[PDB]
Amino acid sequence: ANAPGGSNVVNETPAQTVEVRAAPDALAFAQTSLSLPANTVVRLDFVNQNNLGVQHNWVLVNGGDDVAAAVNTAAQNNADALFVPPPDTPNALAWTAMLNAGESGSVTFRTPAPGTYLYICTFPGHYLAGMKGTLTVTP
């Protein structure tokens, strides 16, 4: 059940691909901002290489910190799937599987309308520790 997912996942050829990496020595993404065009199919490749031996995922939410906390809270209660958002979690646009240190995983999705959206990691504690970034979706 540890698998990618999200309301905007599509089985379509990506128009763009983007790489995200974990910070090697912190509970953070290496990229704290992303930018993509609206209504476009993108493959996001999350490469989790870190020196902590720690797990991480990439989760795009349909909003800011209030929505992020909601999605994060639903994932916190999904220990059997290693803390990814449960399927059909409200306002969770896309996520990768939860990746062990050394693992890489993608998610292919249609970006939402123009606007600003948080991406977070839902492994317990990481979102509260600051593991988040801002996706700005342009026209």
Q: Catalog residues that contact Cu ion under the rule CB under 5 A.
A: 56, 121, 123, 126, 131
Asked whether 85 and 95 are in contact (CB, 8 A), the reply is yes
Specify the residue, 60 or 121, whose C-beta has the smaller distance to Cu ion.
121
d(CA 33, CA 22): 13
Among 53, 58, 49, 46, smallest CA distance to 24 is for 49
Q: Is 121 annotated as a binding residue?
A: yes
Residue 114 or 125: the one with the smaller Cβ distance to Cu ion is 125
Residue nearest to Cu ion (CB): 121
> Which amino acid is it at 46?
F
> Shortest Cβ distance from residue 105 to Cu ion (Å)?
13
Dihedral sign, Cα of residue 97, residue 101, residue 103, residue 109? positive
Query: Which residues does 111 contact at the CB level (< 8 Å), separation at least 6?
Result: 8, 36, 37, 38, 39, 40, 42, 135, 137
> Cβ 57 to Cu ion, closest distance in Å?
7
Q: Check whether 56 is labelled as a binding-site residue.
A: yes
Minimum CB distance to Cu ion smaller for 56 or for 110: 56
Q: How far is the CB of 96 from Cu ion (least distance, A)?
A: 11
- As annotated, the binding site includes 56, 121, 126, 131
- As annotated, the binding site for Cu cation includes 56, 121, 126, 131
